Nucleic acid binder design. Structure first.
Lengths: 172, 197, 49, 127, 106, 61, 122, 58, 48
RNA sequence: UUUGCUCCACACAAUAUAGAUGGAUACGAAUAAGGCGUCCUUGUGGCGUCGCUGAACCAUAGCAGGCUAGCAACGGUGCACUUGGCGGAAAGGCCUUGGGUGCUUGCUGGCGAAUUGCAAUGUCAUUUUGCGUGGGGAUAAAUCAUUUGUAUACGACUUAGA
RNA sequence: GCCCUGAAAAUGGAUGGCGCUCAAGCGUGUUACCUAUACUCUACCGUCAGGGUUGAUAUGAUGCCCUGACGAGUAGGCAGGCGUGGAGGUCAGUGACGAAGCCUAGACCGUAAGGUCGGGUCGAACGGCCUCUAGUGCAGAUCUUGGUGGUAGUAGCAAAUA
RNA sequence: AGAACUGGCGAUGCGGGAUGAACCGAACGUAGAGUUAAGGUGCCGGAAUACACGCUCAUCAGACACCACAAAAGGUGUUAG
């Protein structure tokens, strides 16, 4: 694969004689490829209404992009998953001016602040919030203070050549 | 870049510096290390200490005579962080290592000549702020090496000498800098100023 | 899975070909899935192929 | 002379000395594919004397060809040299090790005459 | 004035090994000022000869040479693969070879 | 390698030479063979395979 | 021929602190060294700078004898004789030379650098 | 190969010599227009410690 | 199988090898700490 | 002992090379701070400046750099001397005084090279040794043989005998 | 989850070693690079396979030449081969102007089995090709006979006083 | 000790897991040159001292299938929930 892309997959099973023009459903899948996109749409639909790639078809495999990626996206996550034992539930607030990567910080946050593989992960509600108070996590409300700025010490300079002859400082 | 290169020790993290050295060694660049005692390490001294104790009990029982040799000297300890990090059994390796000369303090030859500072070792580069580090000093002090102050004082010497040599060199190239100012304004200067150098 | 590939042309490793998409031969594919890699070929491809 | 033959390559010219003739003097260098159930040589182990597999045979176009381009034939006496009389560019007369200097030199004259390219001219002939 | 080097210092490394056996035909080489593999293409193909010294004079000289040439950018920090009219004795490992700048394309 | 779906180096078997040491017999062959090539006619292909035959595929008629 | 025999300082003039003193050995080595000085004169050479260069010895036909081992056994105790012979060679100094000349072979780009020498200097 | 290296007895012919002047004449005429040109050529060239050939533009 | 009766050893290990010290002359393997606040004098001495 | 040894300036038969080809090119500590200049009211300092790689700084044009002239300066600058001073951590190497001498590319001139045939390291280092140069210096010890015990299987240790 | 607790045995010691601490460690996404008797394209080989081919003032059509494919392998099977003792046949072959044997960090042919040649050695009968004939090929059998060793100038020759 | 399906070994080298008959990738005439498996890219050793999100200090860290063991029961250590 690679990095995520939100796909607008809309399936309606496989229309038969008695089931012409089925009800139809739009489930949102993530991943970089479309084959891995439809694979996820069918397992998830393999968890709702009785089917498999054998009894139904995903009408289309569309894409999804942000209409205003110049504003800071203060997202509020919601996810379901398993564990090296059973299964649990969770909620976060990952910020980023891009949906798919806020979800990558998640698939990484699952393997980092919990050590859990992508497989063991079903992402659900991902809705940016408006009002500052609506924001729960204060370590996300950490960058909401009015009139803000901030510096960064110990600039560990990248060495392209082996031996240096200055023995550098933290200047930054 | 230079035939038999030099290496300043203070700051460097034992391991990182050990491999860049073993590389240039089995490559053909004769290199010598200096001040293996100001050679910073990691975590707390007690840890590494107890770890050295491991090499201290490791020896042949039927004859401690022909057993692993646990060199106490801060330099001899680093020579082991290369010994097992290169083929010192092969004709190539034995002599490959020969380009190597590890030294304590900054002896006379290497104090008049420039000493190199490698970023991939220097603590202020391969370590996290607040995360405790160690020093070859305190370890050797309590492991078998008994020349701590011996060198410690030879630096109060070697250092005090090359120290006032810079105060000279400082104001030397201080008025040589006022000569660079009154060397411009001319075309030979205006020209080279736009021609790169 | 061995005969499937013997009797589906692919005699020696890293070798490929085509088959008409039909539930008939469609079953061989899901029988030796961890033995190959397939997909819908494009004009450009087939040509050079 | 000879003919327009491609480069005479043999790939692995190094004799295939029997396994252990270098260890025992009772074992000659005369190759023999060891039959034993253990034999590292027979089981073909990375770092063992490779056996004479036919994949080492010589290219048909240059098989039997000396670096020159003359396939050494074994000449006997007078009548026997007149054999390759018409092959001065693709065959060579190698005089039999069992030839008396008397009859030996007489043949060498017949050789230079017909353009008979001989390989062992110093044969019993003092220099 | 004092400089007569038109080639560059090519520090000779190991043949073409893995963890086990090596390749006694194509050796791997390093060179002065080569870091960017993108801009490492410049030294590609450039013929290279190692200058070693002998005892018994050959053709009026006792300074023989085994010849070679550049092939493709190996590694990711300015390394280079090379072959030879004759492979090196292995005992030459870890030296400094002469990499001339021809054929050119500047 | 290649999946040996069929035995490798399968000697065709059916004799394409007589185990005869008698030249005359072999000549009939050289003749009939030549026939069973240019003539592109069925009949000789049969006699061509027939001369090879043992004292059994050549029983007394 | 050491094979588990003790030392003896008298043999330290050879750096090898290991030796012995073979008596019946010399008894016959002098009987021959006397015979060689005898034949150096029989021809009439300079019986002075006579430096011996070829002294080699090889085992002789093992004289059969035997000892009686326990449990009625018969193990060999054969005499181990030898075959020596040295050549007393005159020591004439001087050698000078007599070897090769090396017919210098060069190329055009090699003989051209010879003329390039007569341009630099003279 | 029976003299080597008995000087020359084969030096030059002034034929090729003359031809040179019958060239540089107009070449050095354009040099007396762009400053330091002769100076640039009156020198050789070799790789110095510190400079990168692949990065150097020519 | 342990000894049979946990007992003491036979010979200080520190005092080894039993190698015959260089020569009949005893080598002084150490000397007293110096005090530069007192008069000069020796520390060792010979004897038979 | 046939004049055997050895230091220094070089020179020539050699000898091998773990691998010269502009330059190993001197603060120390700080690394959640400092380098330099700088100045005031002398410091854990008022003020400016700076890194952000050495991709620096220096070297660097001439028959492997020849032969000759002059201008502007007397700088810089190699060899061989010397002097003030210093270095013992393996000093054995470094800073300096006054000269002699070499050269100058800081500028302007003026002759030179080809045929190494369009490439062939195309040889310009130093390590060490040898029979012969000649400018000085230098006149032993060791073992073995007898001997001793504080010695020991023997070697060895150990003291002794012009 | 991560880290410690849980966490004790015998020769000192193994994330393979060294070494690793915003890692080279646990998880993970992007990667770029790294090299299998494998696959890629190819040269050559033998076998098998499907073919074209006598055309003569020649031949081996058990030939020549073409296209494709393939090569693991003990026990094991049959094919093509090499060598060796005598027999009938034959190259009116070898040969006291050196056959056989033998030695040969000398050369050639063959995948090879072996053949061939240079030199020494040596002194009397021997090789090729076509068949025939077999007491026909040795590293092994605590293999037989005869030979020679490392052990080894070692153990040790020491009772009947000396 | 014993059964079944398939696979191997035996009898099959090879490159990988330090190492090994069985596993991972893979099979072999001889070579040439590309590309990869497997397996890895501090160093030993061919290959990033690559980049991004993290977590984690241990006066007994951990550090990759088979595989060379660790369990119940705990921590106001520290993070996420």
């Amino acid at each position: 694969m690679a990095h995520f892309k939100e796909y607008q997959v809309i399936g309606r099973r496989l229309p038969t004689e008695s089931v012409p023009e089925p009800k139809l459903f739009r489930m949102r899948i993530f991943a970089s490829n479309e084959v891995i996109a439809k694979s996820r749409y069918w397992y998830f639909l393999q968890k709702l209404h009785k089917v498999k790639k054998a009894s139904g078809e995903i009408v289309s495999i569309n894409q999804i992009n942000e209409a205003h990626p110049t504003k800071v996206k203060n997202f509020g996550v919601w996810v379901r998953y398993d564990s090296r034992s059973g299964t649990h539930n969770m909620y976060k607030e990952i910020r980023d001016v891009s949906r798919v990567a806020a979800v990558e910080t998640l698939y990484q946050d699952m393997a980092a602040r919990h050590r859990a593989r992508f497989r063991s992960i079903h992402i659900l509600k991902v809705a940016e919030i408006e009002k500052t108070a609506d924001v729960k996590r204060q370590y996300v409300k950490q960058f909401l203070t009015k009139d803000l700025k901030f510096p960064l010490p110990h600039r560990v300079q990248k060495s392209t050549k082996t031996f240096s002859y200055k023995r550098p400082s933290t200047f930054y | 870049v230079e035939p038999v290169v030099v290496i300043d020790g203070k700051g460097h993290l034992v391991g990182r510096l050990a491999s860049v050295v073993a590389k240039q060694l089995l490559n053909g660049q004769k290199i010598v290390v200096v001040r293996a005692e100001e050679l910073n390490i990691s975590g707390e001294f007690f840890r590494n200490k107890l770890k050295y104790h491991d090499f201290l009990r490791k020896a042949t029982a039927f004859n401690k005579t022909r057993g692993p040799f646990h060199f106490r000297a801060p330099s001899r300890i680093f020579y082991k962080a290369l010994r097992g990090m290169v083929s010192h059994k092969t004709a190539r390796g034995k002599a490959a290592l020969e380009r190597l000369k590890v030294f304590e303090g900054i002896p006379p030859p290497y104090d008049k000549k420039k000493r190199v500072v490698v970023p991939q070792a220097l603590r202020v580069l391969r370590l996290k702020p607040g995360r405790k580090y160690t020093t070859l000093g305190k370890l050797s002090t309590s492991v078998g090496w008994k020349y701590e102050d011996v060198v410690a004082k030879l630096e109060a010497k070697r250092k005090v000498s090359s120290a006032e040599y810079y105060a000279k060199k400082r104001a030397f190239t201080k008025k040589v800098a006022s000569a660079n100012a009154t060397a411009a304004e001319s075309d030979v200067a205006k020209q080279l100023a736009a021609l790169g150098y | 899975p061995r005969k499937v590939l013997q009797l589906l042309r692919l005699t020696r490793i890293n070798s490929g070909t085509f088959v008409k998409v039909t539930k008939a031969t469609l079953e061989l594919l899901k029988l030796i899935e961890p033995y190959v890699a397939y997909g819908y070929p494009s004009y450009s491809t087939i040509r050079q192929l | 002379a000879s003919l327009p033959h491609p480069k005479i390559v043999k790939k692995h010219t190094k004799k295939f000395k029997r396994h252990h003739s270098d260890r025992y003097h009772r074992v000659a260098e005369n190759w023999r594919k060891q039959k034993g159930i253990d034999s590292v040589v027979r089981r073909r182990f990375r770092g063992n004397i490779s056996q004479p597999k036919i994949g080492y045979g010589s290219n048909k176009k240059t098989k039997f060809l000396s670096p020159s381009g003359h396939k050494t034939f074994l000449v006997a006496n007078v009548k026997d040299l007149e054999t390759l009389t018409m092959h001065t560019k693709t065959y060579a007369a190698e005089i039999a090790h069992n030839i008396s200097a008397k009859n030996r030199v007489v043949i060498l004259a017949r050789a230079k005459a017909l353009g008979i390219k001989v390989t062992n001219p110093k044969g019993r002939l003092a220099l | 004035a004092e400089s007569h080097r038109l080639y560059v210092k090519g520090k000779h490394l190991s043949y073409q090994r893995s963890k086990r056996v090596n390749n006694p035909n194509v050796s791997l080489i390093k060179i002065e000022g080569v870091a960017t593999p993108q801009d490492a293409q410049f030294y590609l193909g450039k013929r290279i000869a190692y200058v070693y010294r002998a005892s018994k004079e050959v053709r009026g000289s006792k300074i023989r040479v085994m010849w070679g040439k550049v092939t493709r950018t190996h590694g990711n920090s300015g390394v280079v693969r090379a072959t030879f009219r004759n492979n090196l004795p292995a005992k030459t490992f870890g030296a400094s070879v002469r990499i001339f700048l021809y054929p050119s394309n500047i | 390698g290649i999946d040996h779906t069929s035995k490798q180096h399968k000697r065709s078997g059916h004799r394409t030479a007589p185990k005869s040491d008698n030249v005359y017999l072999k000549l009939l062959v050289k003749l009939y063979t030549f026939l069973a090539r240019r003539t592109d006619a069925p009949f000789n292909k049969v006699v061509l395979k027939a001369l090879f035959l043992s004292k059994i595929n050549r029983p007394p008629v | 021929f050491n094979s588990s025999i003790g030392r003896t300082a008298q043999g330290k003039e050879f750096g090898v602190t290991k030796a012995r003193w073979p008596a019946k050995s010399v008894k016959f080595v002098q009987g021959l060294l006397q015979n060689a000085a005898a034949n150096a004169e029989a021809k009439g050479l300079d019986a002075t700078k006579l430096y011996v260069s070829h002294i080699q010895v090889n085992q002789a036909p093992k004289q059969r004898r035997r000892t009686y081992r326990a449990h009625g056994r018969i193990n060999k105790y054969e005499s181990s004789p030898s075959h020596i012979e040295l050549v007393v060679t005159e020591k004439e100094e001087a050698v000078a030379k007599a070897a090769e000349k090396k017919v210098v072979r060069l190329t055009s780009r090699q003989r051209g650098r010879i003329a390039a020498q007569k341009r630099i200097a003279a | 190969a029976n003299l080597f290296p008995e000087q020359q007895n084969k030096e030059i012919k002034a034929e090729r010599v003359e031809d040179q002047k019958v060239v540089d004449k107009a070449l050095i005429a354009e040099i007396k227009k762009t400053p330091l040109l002769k100076q640039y050529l009156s020198a050789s060239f070799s790789l110095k410690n510190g400079d990168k050939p692949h990065m150097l533009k020519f | 199988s342990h000894r049979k009766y946990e007992a003491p050893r036979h010979g200080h290990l520190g005092f080894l090898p039993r190698k015959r010290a260089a020569s009949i002359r005893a080598r002084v393997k150490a000397f007293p700490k110096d005090d530069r606040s007192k008069p000069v004098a020796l520390t060792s001495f010979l004897g038979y």
